[PDB]
Design a protein around this ligand. Structure first.
Ligand SMILES: O=C(NC[C@H]1CCCO1)NC1CCCC1
Ligand SMILES: O=C(NC[C@H]1CCCO1)NC1CCCC1
Length: 330
């Protein structure tokens, strides 16, 4: 089997991407955040504290004839941005882009933190990291991909995120028309539960490539590119007037600037992030200070190749017995 679904930016900045997901019978379609840095499929629901729902579409398990309460199971997750959610668990039928999993754990939120409430466009998360990170207790549950992968034509999914435009998540096949050149594959460590890999270096604009190992994860659920402070300083030094602002929380730059590209290495291959992809717009409405899309990882403990990086590539998440990542230009 295969599946293919369009993923759409939630706003004009590509702050996140939402993908429609069918849950239950009859289907209830929710727009989820496909997240390769976590492993829980959770949704706003009829069980979510009413004051914490503000415009999201909810899953109502009592209206799904295939929903079954997973007796005694609870979940609770906290993310690297400080957000969180928790609740109970159903199993139900879940379909993405025509690919169907029966008995998928659907984690129903009883509580969500304010950032989730305040974002009416994200109805929940669909985790695509390794199932070792799933938070369901006392019986850990499998991700949608883990449940589907034996049925897939090939045990892979691909992320093709758009810049200020829709893109595609495919399951079970590699669309050879969706990229240019070749896909370069690189080793993955699953020891922390992420799609963790080692970039071979970077360049800023037209500058020389610096060969240096940068261990990080491929995270569709992280918006920006988080790299070591040395690398980030080297980038922003090429933008006149850019500076790290403790009050704002990262590097900012004059909105009048033209940003240079940023290149990262995948083996001997090179992925070029155009400068425009690094502009996250005014820090507050009407400001001429703009927020940068490349930020230091020093305070996170791990480098993150988030959407800023991934959207410059066609990315293969190869879930073979020994997982690997693939990157192609597009
Ligand atoms: O939490 C992370 N990103 C943001 C969350 C919010 C909802 C989806 O993703 N990234 C983690 C990756 C490893 C360290 C932090
Ligand atoms: O990218 C991050 N959050 C993504 C937003 C979009 C929708 C959900 O939240 N958070 C990063 C902060 C420092 C590492 C994780």
């Amino acid at each position: 089997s295969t599946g293919s679904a369009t993923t759409t930016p939630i706003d004009s900045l590509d702050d996140a991407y939402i993908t429609p997901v069918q849950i239950g019978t009859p289907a209830q379609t929710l727009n989820l955040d496909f997240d390769t840095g976590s492993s829980d499929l959770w949704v706003f629901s009829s069980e979510t504290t009413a004051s914490e729902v503000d415009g999201q579409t909810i899953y109502t398990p009592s209206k799904s004839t295939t929903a079954k309460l997973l007796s005694g199971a609870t979940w609770s997750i906290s993310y690297g941005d400080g957000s969180s959610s928790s609740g109970d668990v159903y199993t139900d039928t879940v379909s993405v882009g025509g690919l169907t999993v029966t008995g998928q754990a659907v984690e129903s939120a009883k509580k969500v933190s304010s950032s989730f409430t305040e974002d009416s466009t994200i109805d929940g998360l669909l985790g695509l990291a390794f199932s070792t990170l799933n938070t369901v207790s006392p019986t850990q549950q499998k991700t949608f991909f883990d449940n589907a992968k034996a049925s897939l034509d090939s045990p892979v999914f691909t992320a093709d995120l758009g810049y200020h435009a829709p893109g595609t998540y495919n399951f079970g096949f590699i669309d050879t028309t969706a990229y240019t050149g070749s896909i370069t594959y690189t080793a993955v460590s699953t020891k922390q539960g992420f799609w963790e890999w080692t970039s071979t270096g970077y360049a800023v604009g037209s500058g020389t490539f610096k060969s240096t190992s940068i261990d990080g994860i491929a995270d569709t659920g992280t918006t920006l590119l988080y790299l070591p402070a040395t690398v980030v300083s080297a980038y922003w030094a090429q933008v006149s007037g850019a500076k790290s602002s403790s009050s704002v929380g990262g590097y900012v730059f004059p909105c009048s600037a033209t940003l240079p590209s940023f290149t990262f290495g995948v083996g001997s291959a090179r992925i070029v992030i155009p400068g425009d992809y690094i502009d996250f717009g005014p820090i507050s409405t009407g400001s001429s200070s703009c927020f940068g899309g490349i930020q230091s990882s020093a305070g996170i403990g791990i480098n993150i190749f988030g959407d800023v990086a991934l959207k410059a590539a066609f990315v293969v998440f190869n879930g073979a017995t020994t997982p690997t990542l693939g990157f192609a230009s597009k």
